[PDB]
Protein: oligo-1,6-glucosidase
Organism: Paenibacillus
Amino acid sequence: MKRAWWKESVVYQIYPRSFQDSNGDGIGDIPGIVSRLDYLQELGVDVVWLCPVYDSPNDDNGYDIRDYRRIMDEFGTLEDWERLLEDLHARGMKLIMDLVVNHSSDEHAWFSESRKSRDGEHRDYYIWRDGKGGAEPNNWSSFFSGSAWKYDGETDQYYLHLFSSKQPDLNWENGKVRREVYNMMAWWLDKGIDGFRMDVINLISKVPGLPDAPGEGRYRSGADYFMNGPRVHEYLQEMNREVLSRYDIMTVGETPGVTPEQAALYVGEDRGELNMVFQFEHMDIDSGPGGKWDVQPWRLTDFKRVMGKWQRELQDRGWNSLYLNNHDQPRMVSRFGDDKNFRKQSAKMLGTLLHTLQGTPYIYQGEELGMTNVRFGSIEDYRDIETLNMYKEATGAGRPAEAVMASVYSKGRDNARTPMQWDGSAHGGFTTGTPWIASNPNYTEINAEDARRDPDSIFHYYRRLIALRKQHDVIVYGRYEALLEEDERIYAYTRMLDGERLLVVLNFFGEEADCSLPEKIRFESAEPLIGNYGRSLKLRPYEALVLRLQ
Amino acid sequence: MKRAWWKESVVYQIYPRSFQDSNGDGIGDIPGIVSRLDYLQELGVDVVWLCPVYDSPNDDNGYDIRDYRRIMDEFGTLEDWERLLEDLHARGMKLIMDLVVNHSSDEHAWFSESRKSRDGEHRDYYIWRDGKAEPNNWSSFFSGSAWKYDGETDQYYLHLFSSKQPDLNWENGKVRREVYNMMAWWLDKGIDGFRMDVINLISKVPGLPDAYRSGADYFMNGPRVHEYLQEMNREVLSRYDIMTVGETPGVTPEQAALYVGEDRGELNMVFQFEHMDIDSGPGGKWDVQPWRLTDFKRVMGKWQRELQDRGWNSLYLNNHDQPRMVSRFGDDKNFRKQSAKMLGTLLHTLQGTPYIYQGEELGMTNVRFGSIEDYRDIETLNMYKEATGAGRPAEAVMASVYSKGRDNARTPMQWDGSAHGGFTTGTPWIASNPNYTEINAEDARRDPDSIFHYYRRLIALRKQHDVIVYGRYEALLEEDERIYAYTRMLDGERLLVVLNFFGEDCSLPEKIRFESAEPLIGNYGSLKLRPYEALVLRLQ
């Protein structure tokens, strides 16, 4: 439809804590990011998205912010940060920032002022309500564990904590709250950040009557009332109008459990809200009805459907973000691929997908190296307010630990927050000392040096995926139309733009499949732009080829 | 801010059923409206809002539509209707239509197809859900639950208003798309606006929550109202030159701003029910309670000040769903004339689009029939039944019906002093108030010092001064609980509207310095006081 940079951009997500350490603390630093910057520029990353790098008590790794206008002591100083912006702006690259705004820290001046009394202005900055029958005002649950309300005797009432008790949710139904949100955004936008990734933007508004959750139970989901709220769109349009407009930026949003059509009101060209959004609908292919922990077998078809559905739906007006792994999610080469049998091949084709699909590709740390989910011996080797709260509770319910651990091993978050693997030394040359979380012992195999050395490496495939992306318009803007849809072993689609065509045939299993191509897709000019392995319908295991039909 | 006709327009609400009958049936007809059209033109009415005049079982009297594209048999034919449009357009006047889109009828083509099975396309045109017993502890507006069970499908259907008013699924495009077609169907014919019925009740919280009790939190001011209205505006309302008012229950000045706002591109104006709950209390509408003039003045001023800068206020103190004003906020017995005139001054010397209901100009009073049998309203006659079940004292139940009932305003309009104030030749569907030997149109049109001519004079000056329409609002003596005073100023022009809301000291402030007294109008033809008096002095 229309052209823009963020459309033909590739964003690389950096979890600071476990990217690069420059002081031997074990916690990754911004200056550490600066040290490794040449890596990203060689890969060809265009935009960089650092996870939250603000002042936090570190209950949820930065998402609970004590001060918005201060860089987290552990990461560095505003200067160390300013360097990264400069260097990146000098390497021709861009910086994205994490907007965590529906919830704040307990330590934020506001909350410390809120809890003080029922008379202070700051009391309505957060959702304080009175208990329904000597308990919580609803049967809503926290995401990590337990209720989403915590009591305070100083005021004799509960406060909404849809996440950790240290993440008190903000009352966006207060002009003051919203107005202050815009100031901090401007504060950073005034400094030249080239975009704002917004954290759970659709959780910003709650149903006015703060209802309970039909279905009863001890503690259940209030997702029908906080998620995809009534005033969500009312505020974003204010945000755009108030702050986003006056700056040239890119805007992606963490919208969990949004339907394509709901997204269109976020992602829509003329909506004037956000530029793109993170749907979690393809993160619940392996997940089941009970929760994220309900790991279930998954059908390639139904996967292809959610991918295609989203691709087709937002195509005409709107832009799809392409992501299969973030810091909250397990790593892909394992999840949708063979971590053991065909790690390298798996990653290459899965990467092909997100790169030969329409939308803004996102890459998370280590994706390029084909990093695998981690399986530490004990729970002690883990550190996540979700993991160690799902364990505690489930074990308190008498549930088998081996079972509870099996869930942690596949659906955990620290499966992705392991010290990145740069080299084969101690801690994959991340920290000189000891890491805050154990490093996967794979670094003697999975590392950056090997990749940058090995010409047939995952790193160098992604490079080329990015390289051809900049060298053909079909890849970015081209139409989407799938083939052999019913087939449960071959994911095949075509990207066409103007007269240009692309045939992306993929094999999601470790079996040599039958490339029985249709006739609808005629060809007299086979032009393999890229291939996992360098009519032979015998497609190799976990193989991926993007033939340019032309 | 900006200028537009609907801003300096006066709408007259017509309840067809009890306006004028031209076939002795008792039921008022559209052709009957045509007969009496010279009355409205005389008064000065610019726009005419007929209540629903479409094919209906007549359960809720037009608000249950079996066919949207057909005029109710009892009212006339499309031609009889077309005449009214032509005559009105030829008298320089306009027609507003009722848009009952929230709820269809059971007899409508869709519902009869919906209930058929779980497979037909029409199944998702309405809100059918599985029970939980019933889906939710939501209650209907008339009585009982807001869900009725069907065995054919073994599920309940959402009926917020009545079992004969099945609510429509606005999360379906096919529903919405069809809504737009009928709108265009009428708009193609040249109707000069659309009064929309429970517009904010179109969208329900997706998970159909439990709250028998009010589910207002979810159906009212729902999550996709503003989403749809923009679509509707975009798809149809923008393509024609019209005026649109919306029936929005329980809307705060700020929620309205999203509906009434200039830049929102949704609705031109809305009907707030916040000044209809001054006399009402915490239990319901029936909880008649004593009311403070200050708190009344607040809700009036609040709304006037809030929507002032961008937006437009609708000025209404009685509709077909509400009791009459000369009685409610005035003395029906002591100073009917004075109560009527000062209450009219308010809505005519306040900023906004003044709405007049039938008989407001004649100072018609709330009706007190001997028995309940003399009443005919689904709401009235359903509470009475429920109340007897809880063992409510009929005396108390009727005392509620007498004040807060809807049939108070739907009695045959009193044109003259003959049988039925010259409404029907036969017998009226509802007994006519015997006041027609006192309260009538002829007397008004005759008597120069009549309520009719005061409203007319209010309508006149309205057209002759811009301050009345567009002027700024600022109140005075706000704490005073007896005198409702405010000032309307525009450019250099000022207006001082001093009003006495009771039958009994005009200690004017100095902030309001004047060196030119110019009484544009006055109830009764320096500082004084008078019973239910109202004067609009133009300080200038």
